[model samples]
Target: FTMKYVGSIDQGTTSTRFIIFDERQRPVSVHQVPHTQHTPHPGWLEHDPMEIFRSACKCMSVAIAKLRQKDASFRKIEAIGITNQRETTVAWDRVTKEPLCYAPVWNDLRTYDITKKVTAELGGGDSMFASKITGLPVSTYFAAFKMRWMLENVPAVADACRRGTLCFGTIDTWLMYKLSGGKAFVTDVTNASRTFLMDLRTRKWSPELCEKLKIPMETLPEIRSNSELFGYVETDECGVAAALNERTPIMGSIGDQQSALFGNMCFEKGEAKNTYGTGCFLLMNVGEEARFSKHGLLSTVGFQVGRDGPCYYALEGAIACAGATVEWMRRNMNLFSHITECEKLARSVPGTQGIVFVPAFSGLLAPYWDPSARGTIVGMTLKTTRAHVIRAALQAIALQLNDVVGSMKRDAGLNLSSLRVDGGLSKNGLLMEIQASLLGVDILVPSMHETTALGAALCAGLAAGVWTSLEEVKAVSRRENSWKTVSPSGSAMEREAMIAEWREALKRTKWAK
Candidate 1:
């Protein structure tokens, strides 16, 4: 029997990856390429659109070539899916199909000035003025605010807008457009929900928001479902199209966090997943009805299988620092030489002793949207060792997630079922145990940890008839992939005390002027 294969392009914040999955939902060949992270100013991060596009093409060619060598019968990938960093706004020209300027990354604080101005002037000091429509708050993270900043600051982008040539897109739309040789100017519902310009309920661009945000409606892409015919790969950049040796359609597109949700098989209500990459994003599937957050979480589109299919909704909470904190300890403070030592050192200490670390290096997100907050640690004593500090940092990460989960529970009016975990930090056993103990729920960590890429692959496979339904996808995964379960190990009293100290330390984090 000829084997069926699907490809997924995971365009993340730091790098681009191409993974080929077989009919059994197992990854066969993978290649990753890192791109330059341009930070021209403090609190501002940008990416060259062409650099990202080229890296993606390079990854596709390399991964496909590797697969051909590994499997003698591997001919071509049936379909390709795209999962990307959400809210990273890219502005380009319609005529030349080239970027006007550097794209602003999602966590870039360059929009903070515009963020406050809009909250005060338009929102009347209430940032949630249009939350009912957009299901997002006025902040630096969403795509619209970045678009507004581009128009107001960048002369080239502003000129393109006036000439009716500006095209605004997140990373997913940009990748799809370039891969299709500019034939497809479309974004999936998951990516569109993050732009703060789309109606969450309608799953389309909001004209009222477009006018109010002063962004032209013409610049946006057509919104589509997560799994469907987005476009066919038409570019031969880095010999990608030739390497594939057959026409492959781009059938899936989703935001990275939501892609993890689908990849983890969190299809039912109350199911959730938390990604511990450069940052922490915890998303819970809240089912069909869009549940607006009374707390600080953002309500977003989880995934839609097909066009006009029942769209699953989710509540998301973000933390700006997770693995970033671990890196800081290694690179900045000389805490450990290797990453494995980070977990080892943290495990050396039984507890934080009397300290709590709030690694809010770029401010706090989720449950407390305070940009002025900075990294603060309190209650350090003469007896406090680096082990305690390291343990505190891990605990701090778990503590923040606990608060986010607490807020999600209240907003969605549903208790979280067991959480499926993935990403770089999820491999830390001590951290996983601490997280489970805090939330009082089991955490399932998959041995096939490349769930993010698998999600888009599953979407493309389903659309291309490589797989039939979500049930089949799950069944295949259960049969092949193994999971390790981490259960709660700490007592309720210990958990309560840790949280109490965490709250007290948070009051001291507001150091930015």
Candidate 2:
């Protein structure tokens, strides 16, 4: 029997994955390839654009190979979808289709000087105009300042821009450009929202904001809705093209975190999801209205499903480091063999005994927006062991989310009773229990932890006419399991004291430069 599957490419910060979802939105076959991250200088990160593109192709080939082995008739994939890391900037030659420089990773802080200068020029570095127009503070996290910095500092980029041959894009646009063999130069609204270059209301490139950043509008990609057919895979770089019987259409794309929000079925207003990936992103759906935040939260497009339907909006707060911290301990510090072992080590100790870790490794994001902050572990006594440190790191993730969820509540003026959770780290029961205990709410974990890829497939299925509407697609989503809810077992004052300890640890991490 022939089975129609929707293939999804989830290009994340550290790895690229290819997943084939069956009609019931279940992943039938999966493959992943790890991409190398380069850090030539401290506080700066980059990914080779060519390497990422190749890894994506390699992983997709592997997934298709596995699917064919399982079912010989798995020849026709209905459509392809892409969800990727956002705010990571890539500038390439429009004519030659060669990347001008390595992608400035979302975690990179090379644009700090540019962000500072822009903020100072605007007013007092914390002016209302910055908040009103951009919905984000002057920071190196967004792509606009990074694009400006590249144009000014990188001679190759500046030369390309001067020649009108440069194209600036987030990872999504870069992947689409390469996947389509240079036929498409576009990004979806969700990915564009993180750039701080697109106008929130207009959902297009903002000329005034472009002028403020000194970036030419022509350098950016045309923004489209999430469910639109952006382009097609005209030529397959990997061998999967022949097996699939045709060049599959590339339909629907979004930033990975926003994709998770949609994948978790948080479709209505006031719904929220916290995705635990390289970073932790807490996104609260605010429906059609773009509610400006007095708190340190960003107003961004959640998803644009259709042209006529009202665009969904969200308030977001991000913690720059979450799962990456565990990786650092394993890879850099040689603390453990795997992240799962870290959870075991963390739970070996009852709790972080007076220890607190503030993981601001690439500086802070979201509610804090402190570019100067770095990672810090405080209250380290003589009794501190590797286990205590590991537990502290886990606690740090929860603490950071507390800050984000708190800021989100203040910004949206809606009390979020619970949060839907997914990602690599959410599989750890200890971490989920800690997250719930810290936040004082029940955490809902879907059976499918790979919601990022599921979301991409869902979007593509809708565009491919395999699924009719969001409601229909959501109903077909499978639920596997959920963790037992954990509430604050301690008093309010005790929780406040724990939060205060976190704040104290945060104080020492400032001015990392």
Candidate 3:
């Protein structure tokens, strides 16, 4: 059987998925398994490492099964790619491959004290110093500080470190380790840039930063480019041997948001895209030169092609809760049976009806970086029904993007003419229209919403010599849908008044320590 498809394993925050995409960058089959989120404490979030690994295997098997059922010849998959939730820290035994502790989720705030201590030690929140050394802020969101806390507090992790048997990694590294059957322990530069351990200039683990964080260098994974071949799957050892053959090469890997950036074909400097997943991420390609942000944003490797080539960089802004707010309304409040209902209900009214929601449920990130901030809804009235509140919640998601785009323009010194958007939430027509109006630009939504998986598959296909260059890849990426351009309407004074009201609502929801 000739190899004709690229299988992408997208291990996300809430679930694990396996998707098979053809040469056209269209998905042929996809299987996803939602996993549980553990929150023993109010501010903490975690996932079982084994559970995630198992789910990934299951999803891959199911996807293969579905594909085979459709066309038996589809089993000849060429290569595998991986993209995952970055900054979620995982530590496991090098020999036994057992997790040292539950993975510290990206949203977990348990390391707030550690972040504070590190910031103080580094001279009271000098962001330039923070970004220069580790390419990240002194926040609980990233992996370095969380890894430090685990080594200091978790007995198993501390013991493993002392014994030289501990191995620490972000989700990408951990997934690679498992997928390669412990033969490979590596992370791509894009994923490594988020760990708060890699030097942005050298693109390697920083010894000085590691010493400051009190983390052992031996525990970290080796860093490589996004397209480099990490290793082949060890079919005998991995649980999914029946689904994935032993010789399949794991050719490409990256963090999910960065994968979306690449998938959107934001290759040139100044090109930008926003991915609306569980959270919202806006990234502007900053070319080969890393542009450190004066605003609350991160400078990260967009993607690294090879060892000697100049790396592509990006300035990123993230909001921790976008779709999660909708999830809250659906599961917690039972406001709607389906997400479409929320959008339909939202569109029923011309606007939010003088209501605004600040979706800081897991604390705000990028351009705000307010860890102490919490979710709030303002301008409530007795006449306001759940529909009004829901509309406001959806609008809040778009408004946050406006804030991030404004910061992006200021820091990068480039006016964004448009934004390419994808992910689950982008399918909502009402949401996309609101987002376009809020940003006053066209929102390009591709026909394929599985851009994250397609991205990894494209990288793998490129690395496997199935595709020649980025130009060829771009040819396969055709936009199928786009929102009607939304220029700012009404008078400038009216726009200013509305924005001022939003600012006031935000101020009222300020972080409470």
Best by lDDT: 1
- How do all models score by TM-score? 0.94, 0.86, 0.88
Q: Which of the two candidates, 2 or 3, achieves a greater lDDT against the reference?
A: 2
* Model 1 lDDT per residue over 1-513, tens place: 688999999999899999999998889999999999999999899999999999999999999999998799898899999999889999999989999999999989999998999899999999999898888888899999999999999999999999999999999999999999999999999999989899998998999889988999999999999999999999999999899988889999988899999999999999999999888889999999999998878888999999999899999998989999999999999999988999999888889898999999999988888889999889999989999999999999999999999998888889999899998899999999999999999999999999899889988998999989899888988899998999999999999999999999999999888
Best by TM-score: 1
Off by over 4 Å in 1: 380-383
**What is the full ranking by TM-score, best candidate first?**
1, 3, 2
lDDT of 2 by residue, 113-161 (tens): 8777776876576644656665666678899878888888789999999
- Sort by lDDT, best first: what order? 1, 2, 3
The count of residue-pair clashes in candidate 1 stands at 0
Model 3 has an lDDT value of 0.82
Candidate 1 vs 3: which has more TM-score: 1
Clashing pairs in 2: 447-480
Candidate 2 whole-model C-alpha lDDT, 0 to 1: 0.83
Candidate 1 lDDT at 168 equals: 97
Span of 10 residues, lowest total lDDT, candidate 3: 479-488
**Residue 461 in model 3: shift from native, Å?**
1.0
